[PDB]
Design a protein around this nucleic acid. Structure first.
Length: 67
DNA sequence: ACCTGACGCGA
DNA sequence: TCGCGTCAGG
DNA sequence: ACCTGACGCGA
DNA sequence: TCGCGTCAGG
């Protein structure tokens, strides 16, 4: 499974993503359109259940500024 | 949150 | 190839 | 104030 | 997709 530190980063990114999405008044569906991914994938990261892959980490910082 | 098709990697 | 875990959209 | 169709998000 | 909570007009 994931390393204890991997879990931590999961929670970190997701919490940051959610907070930046509320400031941009975005829905998960809308943010997923921006991030070029599924709305379910948004909730997955947003709940620290899965670390973003390489393609999405690049987009997360591009769209939200979180890296 | 759970069901399922598909990719990543080997007590 | 065979087999579970995981990644992804629905 | 309550009934109901529809959107937001996952102990 | 499935399922409750909530948002909205009636």
């Amino acid at each position: 499974g994931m390393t204890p530190e991997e879990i931590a980063e999961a929670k970190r990114i997701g919490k940051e993503v959610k907070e930046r999405r509320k400031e941009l008044g975005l829905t998960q569906r809308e943010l997923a359109e921006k991030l070029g991914v599924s709305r379910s994938t948004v909730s997955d990261i947003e709940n620290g259940r899965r670390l973003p892959s390489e393609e999405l980490l690049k987009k997360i910082k591009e769209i939200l500024g979180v890296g």
